[model samples]
Target: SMMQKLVVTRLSPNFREAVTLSRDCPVPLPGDGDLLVRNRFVGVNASDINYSAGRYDPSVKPPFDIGFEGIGEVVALGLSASARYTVGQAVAYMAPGSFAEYTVVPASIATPVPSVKPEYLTLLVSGTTAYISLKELGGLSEGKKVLVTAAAGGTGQFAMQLSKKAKCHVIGTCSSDEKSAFLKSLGCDRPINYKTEPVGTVLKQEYPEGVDVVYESVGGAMFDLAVDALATKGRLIVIGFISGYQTPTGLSPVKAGTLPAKLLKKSASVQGFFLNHYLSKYQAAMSHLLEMCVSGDLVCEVDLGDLSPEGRFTGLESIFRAVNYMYMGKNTGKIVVELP
Candidate 1:
């Protein structure tokens, strides 16, 4: 069962060098209560950058598994597994060995993939993140004013569409006009380009009353602007700080002293959500997301155009390049890498 896998050989100043492909890696054997999946697609995220950059406790060494979520098939199952899982059934999970040809994961964590298409990859990770963050964390509902940062990104695109489904007035922020146009197609009411104009300025002039719910992923200056633009009793859900994921410190600090005062004036509250901490509710979120996509209630955007117009690598090795591509703001939708 020899296979190819990515391993972090040593910590490097560059994320691309932090990991290398090992062609002769062994395909894992599923133990009791585990399942072996032949990975078909691996998801790329800004968080992947943090993992590659040694953002975790320095006490841990390198040369470990190097991926987050991926889609695959059940090639083998552990003895303790139930009959619900059959051989060749498509599945997806948030396991680390996804940057490999095959991975063994605990059965309890894997979910049956409703579809084999690449767009379905988002159902497990980004889609679930969007569903939970909006429905629960952001308290999204009918007619609510929602502002999504990095709107055209992997998770943000889902957030934008989910907000629209909730009948909210969706406002999104991006860096270019092309992204702005993409956001509009998803029913975004307002698309702000932070490259030519200030997000804070646009919100102040256009949305004077401010947004009701803020999906704050891009931290630093963008976060500060989102806070300043909160309406009365607004809810700000902190997801990730992609803006500073590359910083050596792996931390994006908000030094705005006026943040508290601003939130206080509007009686607003800020909350943080990490999907890993909410695994208990993942099944429900996945069920809902999959159902919506199946029913056409939600639009799934997986093929981000032109980022690789000339043809991009679809193998596991391309993950390294895809990660940096998104960080460079080249992706307009969910970033996923396919495997043979």
Candidate 2:
């Protein structure tokens, strides 16, 4: 059967102008050591929006592939992969080609989801990012204070949950009161609503002693506040800069000269984290994430409602809308689209 999928025919300066649905796209065939998957759900992320707008690399040319995370069922496998993969096994992968009904990925990148819930999409990218950033990168431990910006969003939600599990004092920053409540449910000790109160004010007044580590994605002012709030010998892990994804100039500027002065007194450090760069920890982190999901130790918040009200998202056609919805702060959890 013919397949329909999303394709960026040209470079778009904005999210809506970037993507369009191609009705006659080919259903990808598995190559050697590859598996053909029938996609069940695609996780909407800030990177999707940013990538479409050419935020990641301004030099990126148009007519490029999009999407990174998906959960699906394996239907066909290459001759060499048949021995390892069954015809109808549930699997998830951190790869491109997810913005389609079917995709072909190397067997090495795809893994068993072990659950029917779409939350597996969260675990595939966000969960792994959280586990690595907190445990391996940030070195989170008990009795330390940690702050997570965009606390109610995909990766931030898991970061908060994991840090709290490590017995660390977790402070989450959100945009609304409803989001604050949601953060509290995820074990956040202080859910600061940036819309109502200043994050700097709250941290200064409530937490006189600075935080030990910061899991920051929202850049701009939030990034500055996180840096300013760091305690002595603190570590700041930069997973992303979602706040500037749509800006015409791309990433928000960080005053490099000021950071050294800021960190000198406290001996703080800022490190950037990209999941692919830490490939060595993939399987271990994924295994632990799945265990947490299965043991109910991790709470996955997914928005599975009819996205019609949120722009009538159905199939790949809704992908652009999903990206915009996330940028607008309309989604409370992992923004996901159910495939047709």
Candidate 3:
């Protein structure tokens, strides 16, 4: 049967021009150990643009499918998948080409969720990224000073709360007072409104000794600021460089000459974190996040964008609007497009 889906018809640096909606695409069938899911909600990320620009994998040419995480209901299952998943069961998964009405996900990669809630979609990507990255690289402990850049954005919100839960003194940086307020609600010890009070200055004045851990995402100058604010033995985890995602050059190179010297001086280290590299921890991290979300200990913020009169961000076409909304830094939480 024919279905609508977005395809990267052309590989362009511009996300808006990169993807084209295919109205006559065939709905895919499930392969062995796979389930055909009717996607209800798809999570939007800053990395969506990177994928459109062909930055993630060089070998994969254009006309490839895009999207990372989605939550939906199982409509059909392959013979081998039936033992584990049943029809109508809700699930969340991370796979390419998730920006579609239907997605075929391998059972091994799909998580059986309580429901097809947008909250589960957040956990699938943003929440898991924060949980796994911190546990693996943060060296988190009680009273540790931690900094989170873009602390109100999708993954940053999780990073902020998780750091606070770890008993860290969390300092979060955001563009506006509204975002700062959101960070404060997440238990951020210091919400740095970078618009009014510069993050670097605030760090130097208030956190004179510097922070012990940093969940750094906003790259470029923010990366530099985080580096400057690192305390002795501090650990900085680079999640994604959102600031550079929209640039013409895409992830501009950092001057590495001083990086070693700067890191060496304080015995600090910087590590880049890509979620795909740590698939071994996915199941546990997702379970923990889902539990926290269910218990009301973790907040899964979903921004469905400015709702139309219908009160929904309808269809695959809305993905573009959702993505641009994120890049504009207008969204306070996880951005999702509802497939109706």
Candidate 4:
């Protein structure tokens, strides 16, 4: 349902942050054993900013249209790929350089969109993120009490739902009461609004012995908060850092004191997760996560649609502005970028 329009990439050198949308790039065609997906929903994410900022590398030109994950209907297939992907069938694809209108992916990379409701489509990434993180990496299971920081984000949103389905007592942190209420609706038993109160205060009251598992996606100041709340022998899962992405900081290592003092004292562990590095491990994990979505056990939180004409994403850009705002303790929830 979509075609190549303008391809924009940020310029390097003086324009490392500059973007150029051009018609110069050729229209791509799918090869044999490949499917050309006419994207219905091309995702925009935090990584998109990294590439455009020239943070990833200088290899590709600037002002390039960049997207990572997307949902679409197969327009046509390469000879061998045709049988694998049916025409008009919706599917999900994740890869680099997905910012273009048409994405040609191998049959192995595409997950069938199946017959799920259209509303459920957007959560595909977040659900998959939660699934792979919990099952494959954390070895998550039933009866484990879970604590997730940034519990109001895209991946965090799904993480909370997955914990609920696992029969784990879910506790999440957001910046506002509004977000806390929303997380409660998604089955989080106890939601903590960090802005309204400190994590230590609530965590102590709810889980004085500490939680069984912590799905951590926050860093900087929030990093310390997670450590203080962890119980003996609990697991802390690191996903990403919205607080420090603006800088060149790396993975937010858990405080050194927590390990010997808190972890050793309690026999806990911490695992840092990088999604692309764990593809094979995620193969089996995604299945269970997808099922959770199909049933009503888990829900995907997404903001849908686009802004007005004017070629201005400012209307669209404002949503992202709010996205950053939420992470900085100003707003909350899975801030979805919508278009009309």
- lDDT of all predictions: 0.83, 0.84, 0.89, 0.64
Model 4 TM-score on a 0 to 1 scale: 0.81
* Candidate 2 Cα lDDT to native: 0.84
Model 1 per-residue lDDT tens digits across residues 152-254? 8888999999888788999999999999999999999999888988888889999999899989889988888888888999989998878777777766778
Candidate 2 Cα misplacement greater than 4 A, ranges: 54-60, 254-257, 305-308
Cα error, residue 63 of model 3, in Å, equals 0.7
Q: Give the 10-residue window scoring lowest on summed lDDT in candidate 1.
A: 304-313
lDDT of candidate 3?
0.89
Collision count for each candidate, in order: 0, 1, 0, 21
TM-score (all chains, Cα) for each model: 0.94, 0.95, 0.97, 0.81
CA error at residue 160 for candidate 1, angstroms: 0.8
Model 4 lDDT, residue 253, Cα? 47
Candidate number with greatest lDDT: 3
Q: Clashing pairs in model 3?
A: none
Give the Å shift of residue 329 in candidate 1. Answer: 0.2
Worst 10 residues of 4 by lDDT: 305-314
